[PDB]
Amino acid sequence: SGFRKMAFPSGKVEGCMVQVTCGTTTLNGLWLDDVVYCPRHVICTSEDMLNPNYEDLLIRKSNHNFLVQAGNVQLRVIGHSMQNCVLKLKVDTANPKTPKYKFVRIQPGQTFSVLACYNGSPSGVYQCAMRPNFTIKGSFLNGSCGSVGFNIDYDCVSFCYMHHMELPTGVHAGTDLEGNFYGPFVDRQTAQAAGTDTTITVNVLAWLYAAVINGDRWFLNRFTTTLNDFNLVAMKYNYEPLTQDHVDILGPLSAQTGIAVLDMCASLKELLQNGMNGRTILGSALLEDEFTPFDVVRQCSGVTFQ
Amino acid sequence: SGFRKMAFPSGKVEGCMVQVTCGTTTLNGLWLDDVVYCPRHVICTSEDMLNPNYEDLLIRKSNHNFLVQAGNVQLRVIGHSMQNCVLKLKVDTANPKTPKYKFVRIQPGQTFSVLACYNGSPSGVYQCAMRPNFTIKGSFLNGSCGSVGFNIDYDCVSFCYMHHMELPTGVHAGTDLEGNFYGPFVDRQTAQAAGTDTTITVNVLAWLYAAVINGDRWFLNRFTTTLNDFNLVAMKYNYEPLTQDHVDILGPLSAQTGIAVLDMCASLKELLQNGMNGRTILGSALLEDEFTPFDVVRQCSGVT
Ligand SMILES: *[C@@](O)(C(N)=O)[C@@H](C[C@@H]1CCNC1=O)NC(=O)[C@H](CC1CC1)n1cc(F)cc(NC(=O)OC(C)(C)C)c1=O
Ligand SMILES: *[C@](O)(C(N)=O)[C@@H](C[C@@H]1CCNC1=O)NC(=O)[C@H](CC1CC1)n1cc(F)cc(NC(=O)OC(C)(C)C)c1=O
């Protein structure tokens, strides 16, 4: 009963957060096995940030320029390389709290939990989604860089995000754990702007299903729609196109409630055209697009992690 | 910048969660030192739950009736006792991952993080407020009982909540860790309902401060109200009265933004009376009341 924006339990990631210092710049690193991953801009001074030559700056560094701290313990750095926009520091000690993990690159619309860290110490956990414009709507201050996003698959932590920067209107950008940016952003102090964001239609439909499961039904109507007619209306409200794959992915949720996906789409179409008329769904006065179909199943069926 | 509903990191609590089974009932327990704490209704069958004579039921239980599992490891139960609605199982092994901890009773309006668990395994985490009517708006399925709510201050875990029940409306009730219910609810199968809830005015103001700090300032106005005049209006909308102590507590946020509390109150008066006119605040079309002043300060200053 009840429906909440809900993050993965973070303990397995907390055990991997360290502090990385290079000169006068401190931020967070991820310690897995005998490697520490962090944003490469830990090697810049403020005066390099406008147009840094990172390859050049890294040559000028030595293993001893990197101070890595896990709690009170300094970890000795015995090697360093750069992959895309992440720095990899080889340390002499493997992290005893390393979980099973992998690195994945997620797609727009997928969700993940963020463990916000400052000086290598976990501060908070929240859920968000990779927006269609490749930003995230996070909560990050100075010091947070190197905070990671992740999912848990049973006992396996999939890391999908590492935090690097803030963009106009207070949204955020970063890389996968191979150091490739999501979207066309670059790690430098330069005017950049995200494109117009859109609403993740498949997620909105998942959340309408969550609403019905939790007993909110008023928006169900007597109509169906074709996929084409649905998209004609949705394009007009800055919604992502709903594809046949999305329809097929919502099928388990449709079986659980007895409401066919295209019947749900006809209800959404009416909500977009007529508005909510002052009314709420699962306590919200707007349509929520940061639960995937899997997040809804997970929450409404209590899938667990260890 | 940015502003999110943010839970505390849950790892210190995860290392304390165990599965407790008694006959056909399994739920979660909290393992601190050599004690496992869990809801006492773990000892009931379905028939028992009409009006359980807890003392009588517990007398008839054996230590051996309690299967406690921590990962792949059974803990041997060597004693049992009851404090109010919580069962304490003494086990022969102290939890090596016991963090520094206290048990606190929180006040309506205050927030905490919930680690929702099933079969002793962490499932997810989220933030709740103790509502003025002594419920929480959680997310809990069968098997969730024994999941805890907590705050972390530095390295100390303050356990404030343990989950026992759902109510009509899809809200939730539970106890502190001494096993006293928040509100007038009881641990038996009986028709129970939450009172009328109210809006946590002081929290709405904290959040409007959060909005300003993050640059969402369209709802600020040049007007000011008196405290009494503010309360005359807001109480009609079923908001809690704002007291001078509330005003005092908002002083840090007021000082940080430079907007006096009674200046901000005129914004809130206008938002209540006229709505948002299709605008949003921090992405919300409704006024949010589950962030405390401290939550805002924590997230907007970045304590760890
Ligand atoms: C569990 O004991 C548990 N094992 O997880 C609780 C879980 C609830 C089930 C779904 N979500 C929950 O929060 N609690 C109960 O089942 C409690 C038991 C407490 C009272 C001793 N409980 C027992 C009942 F007999 C009935 C209810 N609630 C209820 O009927 O609510 C309706 C909304 C369905 C009317 C209850 O919570
Ligand atoms: C970071 O390096 C860290 N140490 O935590 C991180 C933190 C951000 C600051 C405030 N919130 C954050 O998420 N990043 C930066 O400061 C990055 C540097 C990255 C790109 C190389 N950075 C630097 C900078 F000089 C400016 C910005 N952004 C910015 O000014 O945003 C607006 C919206 C004002 C254009 C930036 O992100």
Concise structural overview:
By secondary structure, chain A is an alpha+beta fold. Chain A folds into three domains: 1-14 and 100-197, Trypsin-like serine proteases (Thrombin, subunit H, Beta Barrel); 15-99, Beta Barrel (Thrombin, subunit H); 198-301, main proteinase (3clpro) structure, domain 3, CATH 1.10.1840.10.
Any overview of this molecule?
Chain A is of the alpha+beta class and 306 residues long. Chain A has 3 domains: 1-14 and 100-197, Thrombin, subunit H; 15-99, Beta Barrel (Thrombin, subunit H); 198-301, main proteinase (3clpro) structure, domain 3, CATH 1.10.1840.10. Chain A contains 8 helices and 13 strands. The first copy, chain A, has helices at residues 11-14, 54-59, 201-213, 227-234, 244-249, 251-257, 261-274, 293-301, and strands spanning 17-22, 25-32, 35-39, 66-70, 73-75, 77-83, 86-91, 100-103, 111-118, 121-129, 148-153, 156-167, 171-175. In chain A, the strands form 2 sheets. In chain A, strands 5-4-1-2-3-7-6 form a 7-stranded antiparallel beta sheet, with no helix packed on it. In chain A, helix 3 (201-213) runs parallel beside helix 6 (251-257), helix 3 (201-213) packs across helix 7 (261-274) and helix 3 packs parallel to helix 8. The first copy, chain A, is elongated, with a radius of gyration of 22 Å. In chain A, 44% of the residues are buried. The interface between A and B is large, with 53 and 52 residues. Chain B: It is found in: Host cytoplasm; Host Golgi apparatus; Host nucleus. Chain B: Residues 1-304 are cytoplasmic. Chain B: This is 3C-like proteinase nsp5. Chain B: The active site is at 41 (for 3cl-pro activity), 145 (nucleophile).
